[PDB]
Ligand binder design. Structure first.
Ligand SMILES: Nc1ncnc2c1ncn2[C@@H]1O[C@H](COP(=O)(O)OP(=O)(O)O)[C@@H](O)[C@H]1O
Ligand SMILES: Nc1ncnc2c1ncn2[C@@H]1O[C@H](COP(=O)(O)OP(=O)(O)O)[C@@H](O)[C@H]1O
Ligand SMILES: Nc1ncnc2c1ncn2[C@@H]1O[C@H](COP(=O)(O)OP(=O)(O)O)[C@@H](O)[C@H]1O
Ligand SMILES: [Mg+2]
Ligand SMILES: [Mg+2]
Ligand SMILES: [Mg+2]
Ligand SMILES: [Mg+2]
Lengths: 104, 525, 77, 106, 72, 75, 156, 151
């Protein structure tokens, strides 16, 4: 969705939002890793399924593939993803506003 | 001949001295280094620094504040020490302008170095700078505009001033929200300047935008074991009594009897005295009791049996803030209930902030004391937010004390420099050159502001100088795009006190450093 | 003339020397190109691609680029 | 594979005899099922040499040009006369140039 | 190196190269006012570019193939 | 990169190291099992002598600095 | 506009790159401890104390990191633990990946202020997306609570 | 990242590199120090220096010549080495002007430092200086007077 939003944008903002989306892609890749699955193919299949409208498509480690995960009973509260995204963005914004280190 | 370059040696081992050229070189080098360090953290587009302590604690600090940057650095150059103390005094006097005053002093000393290279006696430079400082002072004073009579215009000025102060800091992300917060917090002080009445509570977690100014008051204390956790229409009594193994203050007293039965009787008498004290306290007809000191177990259960909240160990700041916010009187004797005023509030309860529990006072009577809850993602973010909020509150309180305001964005510096140049053009001698250097530094300030944003600083400063020469006295830098604009229309205002203090302190430090022609160091310990 | 101790830096130095010996010009472009290629390969590796696959893809793209250069080249007298 | 049995105190001579028997059987099987062509066809022999060279080359940094280098190696060995002396194949290394710039001199 | 914005200039030049068939459009490093290197007479030998690409690719492959270091 | 003031082991290295430590602990007491097992004699570097067959006693007297071996000792 | 302002210093760029590299190293460190197939790390401090853990906050706090960006990431994990209690590994991974992308963005020649505002816009859009994807839940449903608890414990 | 400010160390023991700020600062400090040292020995009222060799012979030499002053000093700053070699070459080509060329180069580099502080790309400075040098050389040639005919 953020890739689409960046496509709707213009200038350097579009590039930055594309970078944001590509950075968000890391967690599915890491989940595909550590599980023996091929990260590239798994991430591409997830992206295709989500583009098709399967909002609940996720990495299924029991079957070693990708399937709906609500039937796998893998759910988490919203104030985990929301909190993580907000806090990570705030920390990155704070770090970006730094240009020198002074030794006390 | 000199002390160091003499065939006989007049010094202890490790003690040295630096004559005219060498002392001036070291002083100028130190001042220029300080100015270069503190700058680039100036203006809306300035960046922050990292103060990585090398000590045992290895404390990590991220800040845009010039005073805090200059405080926590190991400085051995004496002129750098002078500039650091200047910045600290600037922070003590007003909350803002630390970076501005340090950079102005450094630029003045750089111009002094150039003038000395041009074979000009430093006393001539000092006289010219005194004249230029005077001229700029009346220029700025005549530039000031006051809006304290009109309440709506004064409120708008406060909004603009807080926004301008917060523009440089990390709070610029939510400048609108934080500016409204700070203005409300200062306006709740009812004209009192005690910033200690405003409490900033930093709780980790949550976004920076989740920070809010509580409508009542918050306390970080606890309640007794068997006491209510919530009362409505509270009648608070704030006290400073001991109520902890309360001893009669006759230090020479002792208990000396001949039987343990008498010891038990004396112990029961002590407990009875404590019970009578609690009864006297309860005679005031109270719901919540707040004590500055500790409250031991017996008075705790005595309060619990009476259904009275007993908040203990609320320090001097705590009881002062509670008295300010609720209107109570800090009492220590309870023989005249009619002469002690009880604080009141609509509701007392326990709130859940983060993973911690706090006592919340709602619907307070007076409210001349504020608590601000700061939420952030890191400890460094919280500390920097607290520093920025403190700067904003200090500037707002100063503006409340003196409502005269001047336009920021380099408009004031351009106006001062134009007045200085006008004075210099009708003055003969090298003092004219000294005053021109003064004007050059004053112009160099907004030049640095523009450079920090990657703008065409030379072109912008030339345009500003031309506009001020023409007659446009309100022209200033428009940092949104990179042009010049009207500061009155764009709402960039500053406190007249802050700019006057910056100018005068910078001139004073430059003058005292320039007077030095010999640095003599004792043997270090 | 650079006093390096890392072996990969020595490989970069040898690459520049090779470009100088074979051609005599472009000894700076090769280093920048190699650095860019390795920088991209870093993010490719972070996504779980075998480095041999990256090398094979680089070889394929290099063949394509060389053919394109031959195509768009111009002759002088 | 034989470490667990060694840990149990099995006599090493038994393990040695088992290895010898298994190795003899394996070598005999390799000789038996190895594919050979009794035609002495020049084209077939050249193709076999090229394929063997490619297989021996498809593990090194020159595996991208394995067909090229296999053709070169086969040509060199075929034009070697009767003893296939390694000293009769010069190997000159010249810095610079692509791998495809390498050449075999007749 | 010329002070221009890298991404914007490169993107505009690439878009111009795609729009009109002209593989000679490059970066106006000297600010001559034109992006066409043919009029600017910026000429490079084809052998040089081919060698650059070849050598860079081979060295990158060689570095990518290393997965162990055993310095003393 | 990490700039952690310490040593780090990852992957097959740490797994094999833990297996080696556990195997060493097992080999220490493997010879004192069953009726044909034989006791050991521990000298406590001040002349104190402890002759025992009990596994727990042997593992308590021994001083161990690898945490996986410590896990087996507490087991 | 022509040549533009010459970047005199280039030291801010070095500091910014160093911070990004430190954060990326921290993420790559706690990258293999994520998900139901993650594995525990083992931390032995200056004393003899030994910790076996999968909690990202615990891993980050236990090992001294010595780099300001890494310490800020540790504080970030602590804040996420305070507000949520899980996702402490995910938030650090996300921050590291964001800064890794910032490396290329800055190298492209984008001021590290356009990047911040663009990231804020992306965060707001992502919050909207996540809220749209969410589903209401009431505490009367024990099955959802059990599924959430099991999902939390799946990685330990 | 930088060749020195990177987590991996790419240098031998004792190797060192200095990036934009440090390189420009060292060059400007060295050149300005050389110019300040050799100046004050310029013009009819210039003074002389004393050169004390620290070697075994401890040779003593008082002089006003800029080239000899710059030749017999221990210079480690590379930009100062450039200026010293320039002065030596000026001495080789013509007898005089050794002090003037060094002072002029030092003043030019000081102005360059100011311009860099003013956020001006050094390539622009070089182009402007090339044009200025062409103009100044043309003017000086146009101002020359020849008297070789009349004895
Ligand atoms: N929105 C703005 N537009 C133009 N100039 C501003 C703006 N906000 C702040 N400034 C300028 O930035 C300068 C420095 O302010 P700041 O860095 O916040 O505190 P300090 O005065 O301690 O340096 C002030 O002199 C002010 O004129
Ligand atoms: N059974 C599962 N199948 C697929 N993914 C899972 C499963 N259980 C957990 N996950 C995912 O693993 C991720 C990492 O969670 P965890 O490893 O507990 O660390 P943290 O909770 O700190 O991110 C979660 O975002 C979750 O979506
Ligand atoms: N009598 C004089 N009046 C005015 N200027 C002079 C006189 N003699 C020399 N000069 C100037 O002094 C400058 C420096 O020359 P000098 O100090 O002799 O050493 P150098 O030529 O090596 O710098 C020359 O440029 C010259 O123009
Ligand atoms: Mg300020
Ligand atoms: Mg070239
Ligand atoms: Mg979890
Ligand atoms: Mg002369």
């Amino acid at each position: 969705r953020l890739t689409e939003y960046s496509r709707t944008l213009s200038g350097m903002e579009s590039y930055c939002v594309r970078a944001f989306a590509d950075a968000m892609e890391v967690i599915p890749s890491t989940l595909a890793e550590n599980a023996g699955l091929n990260p590239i193919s798994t991430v591409t299949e997830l992206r295709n399924r989500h583009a098709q409208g399967e909002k609940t498509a996720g990495i299924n480690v029991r079957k070693g593939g990708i399937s709906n995960i609500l039937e796998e009973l893998v759910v988490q509260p919203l104030l985990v993803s929301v909190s993580a995204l907000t806090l990570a963005t705030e920390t990155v914004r704070s770090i970006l506003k730094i240009d020198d280190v002074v030794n006390t | 001949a000199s002390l160091s370059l003499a065939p006989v040696n007049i010094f202890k081992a490790g003690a040295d001295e630096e004559r005219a050229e060498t002392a001036r070189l070291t002083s100028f080098i130190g001042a220029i280094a300080i100015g270069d360090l503190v700058k680039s953290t100036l203006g809306p587009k300035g960046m922050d620094k990292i103060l990585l302590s090398s000590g045992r604690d290895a404390s990590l600090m991220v800040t845009n504040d010039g005073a805090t940057i200059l405080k926590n650095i190991g400085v051995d150059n004496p002129a750098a020490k002078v500039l650091v103390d200047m910045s600290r005094v600037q922070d003590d006097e007003v909350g803002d302008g630390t970076t501005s005053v340090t950079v102005l002093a450094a630029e003045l000393l750089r111009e002094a170095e150039s003038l000395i290279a041009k074979k000009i006696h430093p006393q001539t430079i000092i006289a010219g700078w005194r004249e230029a400082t005077k001229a700029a002072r009346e220029a700025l004073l005549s530039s000031a505009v006051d809006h304290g009579s009109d309440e709506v215009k004064f409120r708008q000025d406060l909004m603009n001033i807080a926004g301008t102060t917060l523009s440089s800091k990390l709070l610029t992300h939510h400048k609108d929200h934080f500016t409204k917060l700070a203005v409300e917090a200062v306006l709740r002080l009812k004209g009192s300047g005690n910033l200690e009445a405003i409490h900033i509570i930093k709780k980790l977690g949550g976004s920076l935008a989740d920070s809010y100014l509580d409508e009542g008051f918050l306390l970080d204390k606890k309640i007794g074991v068997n006491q209510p956790k919530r009362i409505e229409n509270a009648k608070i009594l704030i006290a400073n009594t001991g109520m902890d193994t309360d001893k009669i203050k006759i230090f020479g007293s002792r208990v000396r009897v001949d039987s343990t039965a008498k010891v038990a009787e004396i112990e029961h008498a002590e407990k009875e005295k404590m019970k009578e004290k609690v009864e006297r306290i309860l005679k005031h007809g109270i719901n919540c009791f707040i004590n500055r000191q500790l409250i031991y177990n017996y008075p705790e259960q005595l309060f619990g049996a009476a259904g009275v909240m007993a908040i203990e160990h609320a320090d001097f700041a705590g009881v002062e803030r509670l008295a300010l916010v609720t209107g109570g009187e800090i009492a220590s004797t309870f023989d005249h209930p009619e002469l002690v005023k009880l604080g009141s509030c609509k509701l007392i309860e326990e709130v859940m902030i983060g993973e911690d529990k706090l006592i919340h006072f709602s619907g307070v009577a007076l409210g001349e004391a504020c608590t601000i809850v700061l939420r952030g993602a890191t400890q460094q973010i919280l500390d920097e937010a607290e520093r920025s909020l403190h700067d904003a509150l200090c500037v707002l309180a100063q503006t409340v004390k003196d409502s005269r305001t001047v336009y920021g964005g380099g408009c004031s510096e351009m106006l001062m420099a134009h007045a200085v140049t006008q004075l210099a053009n009708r003055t003969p001698g090298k003092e004219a050159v000294a005053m021109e250097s003064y004007a050059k530094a004053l112009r160099m300030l907004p030049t640095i502001i523009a450079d920090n944003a990657g703008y065409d600083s030379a072109d912008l400063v030339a345009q500003l100088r031309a506009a001020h020469s023409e007659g446009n006295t309100t022209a200033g830098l428009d940092m949104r795009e990179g042009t010049i604009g009207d500061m009155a229309i764009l709402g960039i205002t500053e406190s007249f006190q802050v700019k006057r203090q910056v100018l005068l302190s910078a001139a004073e430090a430059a003058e005292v450093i320039l007077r030095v022609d010999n640095i003599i160091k004792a043997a270090p310990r | 003339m650079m006093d390096v101790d890392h072996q990969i830096a020595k490989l970069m130095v040898e690459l520049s020397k090779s470009q100088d010996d074979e051609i005599g010009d472009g000894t700076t472009g090769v280093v920048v190109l190699a650095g860019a290629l390795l920088e991209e390969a870093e993010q490719l590796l972070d996504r779980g691609i075998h480095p041999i696959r990256i090398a094979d893809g680089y070889e394929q793209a290099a063949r394509v680029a060389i053919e394109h250069l031959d195509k768009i080249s111009d002759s002088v007298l | 594979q034989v470490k667990p049995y060694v840990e149990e105190g099995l006599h090493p001579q038994i393990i040695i005899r088992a290895f010898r028997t298994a190795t003899q059987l394996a070598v005999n099987k390799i000789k038996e099922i190895a594919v050979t062509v009794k035609k002495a066809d020049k084209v077939e022999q050249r193709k076999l040499l090229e394929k063997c060279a490619m297989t021996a080359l498809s593990s090194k940094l020159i595996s991208q040009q394995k067909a090229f280098f296999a053709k070169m190696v086969v040509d060199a060995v075929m034009m070697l006369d009767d003893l296939l002396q390694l000293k009769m194949i010069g190997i000159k290394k010249v810095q610079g140039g692509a791998l495809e710039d390498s050449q075999l001199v007749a | 190196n010329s002070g221009m914005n890298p991404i914007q200039t490169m993107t505009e030049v690439r878009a111009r190269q795609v729009k009109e068939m002209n593989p000679a459009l490059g970066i106006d490093c000297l600010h001559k006012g034109t992006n066409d290197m043919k009029q600017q007479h910026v000429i490079e030998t084809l052998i040089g570019k081919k060698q650059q690409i070849s050598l860079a690719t081979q060295m990158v492959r060689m570095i990518l193939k290393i997965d162990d270091i055993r310095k003393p | 990169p990490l700039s952690v003031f310490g040593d780090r082991s990852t992957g097959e290295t740490i797994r094999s190291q833990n297996v080696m430590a556990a195997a060493s602990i097992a080999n220490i007491v493997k010879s004192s099992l069953g009726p044909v097992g034989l006791d050991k004699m521990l000298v406590d570097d001040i002349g104190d002598v402890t002759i025992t067959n009990d596994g727990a006693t042997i593992l308590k007297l021994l001083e161990v600095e690898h945490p996986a071996a410590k896990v087996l000792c507490e087991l | 506009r022509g040549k533009g302002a010459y970047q005199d210093r280039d030291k801010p760029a070095q500091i910014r790159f160093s911070n990004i590299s430190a954060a990326k190293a921290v993420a790559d460190a706690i990258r293999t401890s994520l998900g139901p197939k993650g594995m525990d790390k083992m931390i032995q401090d200056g004393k003899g104390d030994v910790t076996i853990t999968n909690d990202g906050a615990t891993i980050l706090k236990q090992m001294q990191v010595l780099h300001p960006a890494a310490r800020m990431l540790v504080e970030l994990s602590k804040a996420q633990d305070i507000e949520a209690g899980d996702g402490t590994t995910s938030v650090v991974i996300i921050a590291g990946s964001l800064l890794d992308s910032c490396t290329k963005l800055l190298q492209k020649g984008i001021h590290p202020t356009i990047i911040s505002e663009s990231f804020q816009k992306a965060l707001e859009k992502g919050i909207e997306i996540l809220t749209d994807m969410s589903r209401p839940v009431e505490l009367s449903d024990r099955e959802t609570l059990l599924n959430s608890a099991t999902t939390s414990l799946n990685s330990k």
